[model samples]
Target: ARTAVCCICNDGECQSNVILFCDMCNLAVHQECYGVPYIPEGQWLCRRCLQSPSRAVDCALCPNKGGAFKQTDDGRWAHVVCALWIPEVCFANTVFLEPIDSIEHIPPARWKLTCYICKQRGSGACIQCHKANCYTAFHVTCAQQAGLYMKMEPVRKTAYCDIHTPPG
Candidate 1:
């Protein structure tokens, strides 16, 4: 099985040291990120998957499929990383970081930026590489799929393209 990542923050580690996995859909999320005030006993299921066990949807903010999905304000699905990296998107509940909102606020320029990974444009909002002088732009899922470097801090997050990624 693939490693688990929080559906809200798109991170593998949790400060709380507990990541809950949905029994039905298999999506993983931190208790705090999912607004679970307390830990449940067993057989956890995410709210969406609990409501509709068989439904699967594409991310509204990225081209790729799968990995940490949450609902949007308009009842659409999107990746958590896609919402977090897009400068204009915000969560309805900052604490839980859910029901992604403010996607309409994204400027047209962002949607027009070309993703270097897929060599396509206008599929979704593209974020620029973290390197100061590098202008490479890509969708969040594109960067993840390519195994590019990513660092998330409390107040800021950074991502690098293939060329700018530091050596391991």
Candidate 2:
């Protein structure tokens, strides 16, 4: 069983099929049910975070994934995809594979996500940043909070500043 990384904290506990990935956010959903493509490699994500900055060589976020989000000492949030891995109980959510077909789609969930990145329904995000996308209408806060200080000079390695430098 392979695993994906959590964009918010760069954690690797999150894993799932390709279709429901927020690769840019290092998080992934179950696929179409969550508004994502089918990532056959068992990985996925959005485009905005995919275009964000990256590490020199080691790759700041997980490979084949890009959306990287920042985490602070406070209410640091993570994508619903990441939260699923918080426990092995997520297997009950059939949406992880097929569409919301039957009653099985309604798993016993106890989450109140506000999409810190998108500030919306939660889930349906990138592999890492888990922010909203213009093409897909991602959240504003998440769009700006996309991690990676690509603009920072070489001297600013550990910097957590969002890459507002834009494409140069």
Candidate 3:
């Protein structure tokens, strides 16, 4: 199983000091993000996974599967990280952070950049490496899936490709 990480915000640490893991799909989410006012006993399952025999769905913003997923405005699925990093997407309901909106606002230039990790283009917006003068870029899920270094600082979020990541 993958490490516990919030599907909504792609964060492991919960400000409310609570993170819930689904018993079936294994998707983790913060209580606040998932609107869980209180923890349930024994087992927990996300609404999507709790359906009568769940099925897998691909993220609309990226060429990957199985991260934290929320429905888009058009009833499509998208990873929170993908919507957050794309620079143009926004949540219609900021409080609940659901129904990801404004995807059409993304410019064509973002789609033109090729992903260094997947060696693909036009699949999704790619975030650039944090290192100065580095042109490397990759899909948000691609970077996460590849185990690239990512740090969320007080002022800004930083990510690095494998080649540009600082030594630990």
Candidate 4:
């Protein structure tokens, strides 16, 4: 059992399948144990490195401060809700791996979601435009059929809605 500096959940014994090494402080952490939902691409440093230097960093999401938060690709600390609220994340009721063209394709009552286009509630997968001010949330099928849901890269590192898209 290889133990690490930031392992605390299982007393540093809960070895992880994927471990993250902080370049700054040399803190080795289990992804989930460190509250990291996913291993972000590019160089990363543990929270202590940033927080300790200044001793505290504000969450880019909510007004609350302190505690563990996931670091974004841009090296910004954010709560999971804030990160999920970004204009790039789309899947709300379904997994991105499973492309949902119709709500009926999903099992009955698997999840409840609202369609921005239809202005109606439905079950199963839906798309959420991650724009901070946009109130649009639609069924994957509704947006696709209505010609509104812009196709996004499945493994896209950055995402933006139609209104927020920048010209190439």
Clashes of each: 0, 34, 1, 1
lDDT of 2 by residue, 1-168 (tens): 123443333434434433244544444433432433445465443433444435312111112122323221132322332322222212234444211122223233312333344445434322222133412322322443554431214422122224232444
| Candidate 4 collision pairs | 87-130
Worst lDDT 10-window in candidate 4: 95-104
What C-alpha root-mean-square deviation, in Å, does candidate 3 show against the real structure?
3.8
Error of 1 at 147 (Å): 1.1
The whole-model lDDT of each prediction reads 0.78, 0.32, 0.75, 0.44
Q: Is candidate 1 or candidate 4 better by TM-score?
A: 1
Pick out the ten consecutive residues of candidate 2 with the lowest summed lDDT.
56-65
For each candidate, what TM-score against the reference? Answer: 0.83, 0.20, 0.77, 0.29
Compared with the true structure, what per-residue lDDT tens digits does model 3 show for residues 68-144? 77778886778877776676787786666677888788777778889988999998778889999998988889988
Per-residue lDDT of model 4, residues 1-168, tens digit only: 122533322224444335666765555655654555555576666665755654565543334453334444444554332233333332222321111122223433323556656666643234466566765565443443455434334644233346755455
Name the lDDT value of residue 2 in candidate 4.
Answer: 21
lDDT for model 2, please: 0.32
Name the TM-score of candidate 4.
Answer: 0.29
Q: How far out, in Å, is residue 39 in model 1?
A: 2.6
Compared to the true structure, candidate 1 yields what TM-score? 0.83
Report the C-alpha displacement of residue 157, candidate 2, in angstroms: 42
Q: Which residue ranges in model 2 land beyond 4 Å of their true spot? A: 1-24, 42-45, 55-168
Alpha-carbon RMSD, candidate 1: 3.2
